[PDB]
Design a binder for this molecule. Structure first.
Ligand SMILES: N#CCc1ccc(OC[C@@H](O)Cn2cnc3ccc(Cl)cc3c2=O)cc1
Ligand SMILES: N#CCc1ccc(OC[C@@H](O)Cn2cnc3ccc(Cl)cc3c2=O)cc1
Lengths: 203, 203
């Protein structure tokens, strides 16, 4: 009985080639979604008995778990096309700390260095859809995975601000936190390669 | 009079296409090398009057400076080919926290989350050459830029441990910390693109 956690920032499609692989080796496989901001909070609860977590969030050592890199995914800073900072200049990008940010909140109330909001003017939400609702309505700017803002960008309903900061979008590591048991377990190594293979393709 | 800081982790070659560009626009251009672990410590000293810093080190806001991404470079965990952990398994990689690490030290004595040593058994050095001296002699393992360990790897004098953690080597962002003045300054934007172009090629 394997239990896998995937945060909202992982493409849902990524699951496709992965869950096939696990199911070839494991007979029961449970899949769980959390906010990127709740992933690590969740695996630390011992009763949660999570075996593997795929998440963008980073911490330097979780008691029962080793860490490794599955690959990279792109996220963008986005606002209402006629947001003040729409011109996307370097002065614009510096000033994100002053303008209202739509951030993912956390059960634990606390945030990693990676996921903490950057502005004093913050408005917390439980998922990216809620976030992008308020960003379309010009309530604030937010940062969200490619696969969320892909549609709304071509539709002209949202504008990118991030390009002069990180051209091509903000590259962000997809980490795999795994219960120590699964080191020297050919099942997990089998998963690890196909998972990497899969996430290279989505690039 | 421009003053640019490049840490040891930046390929020396990167300077080539860059310093040409700056010199087309700026008439005096001073180039300074520090340890990655001293880069940000240095620019914070006000008398240091650094205008631009190219460094792998990360912090969330430095008073007088904005941040952006120039691109990505690869670093590897390396040891003596017959180091205990030479087999490079996931149990090996987890155990790096127990075996002696050769780390870059810092004037400020303190380290960023990114650059802090991961093991209790640490031996500090001022540069990568000193580091790789002691790692060849099996004194410990260390992590160093590609361009340092490139030679010693083909020569069989050093072995990679990092592959099952991050296949292809540990991708690490090259950041550009720049004095706020240089936002809305076509000279700097001119530098910013060629710098990105240059560092894409070195990939
Ligand atoms: N232009 C610009 C640069 C810029 C980048 C990040 C900025 O802050 C966002 C922070 O609130 C927390 N953060 C950071 N990196 C993430 C990566 C991926 C994903 Cl999916 C979510 C996040 C995320 O929430 C601000 C400015
Ligand atoms: N196998 C394995 C995974 C692993 C990665 C880093 C590990 O820790 C190194 C730390 O001491 C501080 N660090 C982190 N990332 C760096 C990136 C580039 C460069 Cl050039 C230097 C550094 C660096 O010194 C340990 C294990």
């Amino acid at each position: 009985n394997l239990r896998v956690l995937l945060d909202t920032a992982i493409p849902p499609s990524f699951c496709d080639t992965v869950s096939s692989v696990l199911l070839d080796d494991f007979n029961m496989v449970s899949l769980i979604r959390t906010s990127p901001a709740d992933s690590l909070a969740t695996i630390k609860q011992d009763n949660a008995e999570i075996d593997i977590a795929i998440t963008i969030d980073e911490e330097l050592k979780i008691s029962r778990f080793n860490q490794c890199v599955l690959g990279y995914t792109k996220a963008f800073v986005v606002a209402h096309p006629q947001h003040p900072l729409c011109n996307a200049s370097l002065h614009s990008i510096a000033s994100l700390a002053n303008y209202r940010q739509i951030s993912l909140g956390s059960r634990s109330g606390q945030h990693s260095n990676l996921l903490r909001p950057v502005s004093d003017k913050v408005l917390f939400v439980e998922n990216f859809d809620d976030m992008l609702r308020l960003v379309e309505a010009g309530v604030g700017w937010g940062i969200a995975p490619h696969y969320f803002v892909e549609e709304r960008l071509r539709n002209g309903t949202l504008a990118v601000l991030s390009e002069l900061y990180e051209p091509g979008g903000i590259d962000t590591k997809v980490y795999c936190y795994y219960n120590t048991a699964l080191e020297s377990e050919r099942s997990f190594l089998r998963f690890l390669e196909s998972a990497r293979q899969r996430l290279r393709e989505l690039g």
